[PDB]
A = this chain, B = another copy of it.
Amino acid sequence: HSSNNF
């Protein structure tokens, strides 16, 4: 799984 927070 991958999470990306900007």
Instruction: Report yes or no: A5 in contact with B4, Cβ–Cβ below 8 A.
Output: yes
> Out of B1, B2, B6, which one reaches A6, CB within 8 Å?
B6
Tally of this chain's copies:
4
- CB nearest to A2 among chain B residues: B2
Number of A residues with CB within 8 Å of any CB on chain B: 6
Instruction: Report yes or no: A1 in contact with B1, Cβ–Cβ below 8 A.
Output: yes
Instruction: Report yes or no: B4 in contact with A4, Cβ–Cβ below 8 A.
Output: yes
Instruction: Report yes or no: A6 in contact with B5, Cβ–Cβ below 8 A.
Output: yes
Residues of A within 8 A of B (CB): 1-6
Listed A/B pairs (10) with beta-carbon separation below 8 Å: A2-B2, A2-B3, A2-B4, A3-B3, A3-B4, A3-B5, A4-B4, A4-B5, A5-B5, A5-B6
